[PDB]
Write a protein that binds this ligand. Structure first.
Ligand SMILES: Oc1cccc(-c2nc(N3CCOCC3)c3oc4ncccc4c3n2)c1
Ligand SMILES: Oc1cccc(-c2nc(N3CCOCC3)c3oc4ncccc4c3n2)c1
Lengths: 550, 550
């Protein structure tokens, strides 16, 4: 009662999923009802009661109903499969309903998956309701209709989900999605003006995509030099009237990738093509207002669902940091897959580090080209350097938590500002083609760019990682919930060892460690990675190795 | 404000010897007058005042007398030469007098050192008193009070009094002073009463015995052969009665110089071995006065152990602090004394040197296993032994590290059957090394393997232990620093090269600046490079990491 209070608070604050204390769940039970007061306790409380099969349920329902209001994130656990019960899911949905729309968007990528979880009966009921002779799905529709950008992402997520059938229960989940998608569209058609308007916009978007897909297929079909493929791409765009849509100009359409931006046309002349063998295209665009141009990318080869989830994760983590009042200048570009084997990727001006290095031997020469200050730490303006150290820190930390693999100098990008970002996300959760990842992913060039291990800045960088680590850990709970829901995603790296995937993210979190311990541990990974990269730190270890041999 | 004290709590509690305090002196001044919070505060207050005014001294003196009484260790700082004042030295001695003999003997090696610093006019005056200030009178008086103290005091003086006759400048001047002190002490004992005369007779015997022992060692070295033939000769000489002014096979009992508490009779000639080391020390057994419990010691003819005794004093003290703390690592801090230089004894703790252990069983585990086997125990080894070894290991790297002992190799570490490990033979201190190199931390692959590789409850446990050990020693810094200050003119070789740097060097290794969290991080880092360079697998892992990037 007196000191055990503290053991409760540590249990409520700390774990996202627990084996422990099933007898102590009964102990939570004893002090539960009285210490109903605070929300996170509620979710843990809901966990134990259900375990005892029958009368517990009725007693817990009242308990829940009276309980201090469950936070939005805790709700993400309830849509998840682990809780089956029908009423609790309703309450979890009530909780989402309380959340504003932006939160809804990120969560939404997860909630679409989250549909896979019951009840099938609900969907069939609604289907029969649209034509004759959970609460959640209906909720998603209603709110999906309420906001147009929201409607767009919803739609696209559904179309990818339905697209193909191939191992056994994937077919049944698919069948469920198709009906939900069809309902959604039918409600738009039955709709008051704004819905009808959003719908026509979706058909507009649909049409546009397929006509561009046909164009791309035609560009791929011709054998080619790299250059002739870009030229053919360019001429094809300019040939208005050999496609149902004419690409040099058409009706203002809201961009699928970024719905709040309308586009009229592409500019053929400006379109350039990317070096990677599966060849991504950059198209310049024209927008409804002040003829602003949008640059985006269209990739025809493979599945962006992975790339996009990882960006959702980054986007989320940046938002959390800034909410913790930390901004490391991460660049989380939007990514959408239209369908498997094609999507758009927001383009942000960048030079691939390898290209920076090819173009200029040193990274600093590069920055000094764009921003010079005479007293500035190195030829550069102080702010550019500072922002570069910051970007690195966030990115190593996230890469670490995400076990992003395959990183190399073509993968890291640099801007004139100094933000550093990562580009390609084929390898996730420790997957790597190479045999042994470094724990942390660092380039000799990047480290020399911080002024080396023996540098003032380099220290600031290290400092930043640690703190980023500590903060990200605090909001462990959201990320884990999202990943729990992303088990059946169809991201390849999740698909190989799905059950295990979430544990892998949590292992990077080292949530078991107290904070001093965590920092030390991360200190370790930096040390090894950095010694590995540096030519002199290795030479030194060698001389130390020598020592004992005589 | 209220913070005034907070800036002050940091000044009184944190630095052991500061150049730093400059302006601070005046603010301390304003506040000391109403409150003398602590014993520790007095050392701090004292630093600023004495030279500057003849009058200042009078105001400070009344402050000091009514001031809360200083802790003994802090007094050592006072005797250190910097404070010139006749009145403060008297104060320091008054504090020492209150301190119990055992603490007093521990420190004494330094006090013998302190004499040079205390003003000579006082010593000549005391001399005048006998044949035809306070500290010297105090050492002689207390020395007479306790026999062991007398014995240690005598030996320390003899070594310093015994001349090189290759004296330059003030060393020429100091010898006469030490010689005078010894002469005075010897005259007080002869003159003194029943008990003092008793001490004098015992010392006469100790002196007579050594010279006779030494004649024998010189005869043995002169004789030609490999180690075994020389040992055979040594054995014969002991047993030859009355070839010497003493009969080694039996004698009148003499208080052992290494432990005054136990007399010996006879050596046992056959029970004597010789060591692998360069100027092979004998071991002897002895008999002793009771139930013939043997004792053994070493006797080393080759070099001056003044330095070895200082290092062991350090370890003896540190162990004491930790046991005080209730952190007990199974440290072995064997008694050395020097004799008058180029002889000494060392207490013998029965141990096998690691190199020996590696040759006799394949590796350390095999060896503990042979002496202490428990099927269920960690490595089939009784739990206790592993634990004593983890701890012995931690205690030693940390202590070795603070003291910058160098030139460690397999001949240099040893084990016990209980598990403990220790070091030995420290010719190199404060980072003198024959090799151009660190490791910053001295570990052997063999020992890491002994802990069952990098991940083990045990290795991790070893690491855990080092940090706790590091923090406690950090806490008790002042005492160590004060003893080194007193050893500036020590005539210990490692100290000599730059006498001033020596105090700075331990202070620096000590790492006092950093917050504990940073101190632990700092220590963790050193262990990590030391361990990677010592494990072959770790180096391969780093190569894989360097190659990731190419
Ligand atoms: O195959 C893929 C999958 C995912 C991303 C890309 C991609 N994105 C890029 N972005 C450019 C800068 O703005 C943000 C996005 C990108 O820039 C490049 N520059 C050179 C080579 C390849 C790429 C490249 N590949 C390529
Ligand atoms: O040059 C020095 C200085 C100080 C100590 C030694 C030394 N001590 C030793 N002790 C034996 C075990 O109990 C503790 C004492 C010692 O044992 C050895 N066994 C083999 C070679 C050298 C030594 C060796 N050297 C050698």
């Amino acid at each position: 009662a007196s000191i055990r209070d503290q053991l409760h608070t540590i249990v409520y604050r700390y774990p996202p999923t627990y084996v422990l204390s099933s007898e102590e769940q009964d102990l939570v039970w004893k002090f539960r009802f009285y210490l109903s007061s605070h929300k996170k306790a509620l979710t843990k409380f809901l966990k134990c009661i259900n375990w005892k099969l029958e009368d517990e349920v009725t007693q817990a329902l009242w308990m829940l109903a009276n309980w201090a209001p469950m936070d939005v994130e805790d709700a993400l656990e309830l849509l998840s499969p682990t809780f089956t019960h029908p009423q609790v899911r309703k309450y979890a949905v009530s909780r989402l309903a309380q959340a504003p729309d932006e939160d809804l968007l990120l969560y939404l990528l997860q909630l679409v998956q989250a549909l896979k979880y019951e009840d099938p009966r609900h969907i069939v009921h609604l289907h029969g309701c649209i034509f004759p002779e959970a609460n959640l799905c209906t909720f998603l529709i209603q709110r999906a209709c309420t906001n147009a950008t929201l409607a767009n992402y919803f739609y696209w997520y559904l179309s990818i989900e339905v697209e193909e059938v191939e191992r056994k229960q994937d077919e049944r989940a698919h069948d469920m999605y198709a009906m939900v998608l069809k309902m959604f569209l039918k409600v738009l058609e039955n709709g008051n003006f704004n819905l009808r308007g959003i719908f026509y916009n979706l058909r507009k978007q649909r049409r546009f995509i397929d006509e561009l897909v046909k164009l791309v297929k035609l560009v791929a079909k011709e054998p080619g030099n790299r250059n002739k493929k870009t030229e053919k791409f360019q001429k094809l765009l300019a040939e208005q009237d050999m496609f149902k849509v004419n690409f040099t100009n058409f009706e203002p359409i809201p961009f699928p990738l970024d719905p709040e931006i309308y586009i009229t046309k592409i500019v053929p002349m400006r379109t350039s093509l990317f070096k990677s063998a599966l060849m991504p295209a950059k198209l310049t665009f024209v927008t409804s207002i002040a003829h602003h141009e949008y640059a985006a990318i269209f990739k025809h080869g493979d599945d962006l669902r992975q790339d996009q989830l990882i960006l959702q994760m980054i986007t989320l983590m940046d938002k959390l940091l800034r909410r913790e009042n930390l901004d490391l200048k991460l660049t989380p570009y939007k990514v959408l897959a239209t369908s498997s084997k094609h999507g758009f990727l927001q383009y942000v001006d960048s030079c691939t580090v390898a290209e920076v290095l090819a173009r200029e031997g040193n990274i600093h020469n590069f920055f000094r080209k764009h921003h010079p200050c005479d007293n500035g730490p190195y030829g550069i303006s102080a702010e550019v350097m500072d922002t570069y150290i910051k970007s690195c820190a966030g990115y190593c930390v996230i890469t670490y938590l995400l076990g992003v693999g395959d990183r190399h100098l073509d993968n890291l990008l640099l801007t004139t500002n100094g933000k550093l970002f990562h580009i390609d996300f084929g390898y996730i959760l420790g997957r790597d083609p190479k045999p042994m990842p470094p724990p942390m992913k660092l380039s000799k060039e990047m480290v020399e760019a911080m002024g080396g291990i023996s540098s003032e800045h380099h220290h600031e960088f290290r400092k930043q990682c640690y703190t980023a680590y500590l903060h990200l850990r605090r909001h462990a709970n959201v990320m884990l919930n999202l990943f729990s829901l992303m088990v059946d995603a169809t991201v390849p790296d999740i698909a190989l060892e799905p059950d295990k995937a979430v544990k892998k993210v949590e292992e990077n979190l080292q949530l078991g460690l107290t904070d001093e311990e965590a920092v030390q541990h991360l200190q370790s990974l930096l040390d090894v990675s950095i010694t590995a990269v540096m030519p002199a730190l290795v030479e030194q270890i060698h001389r130390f190795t020598q020592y004992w041999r005589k």
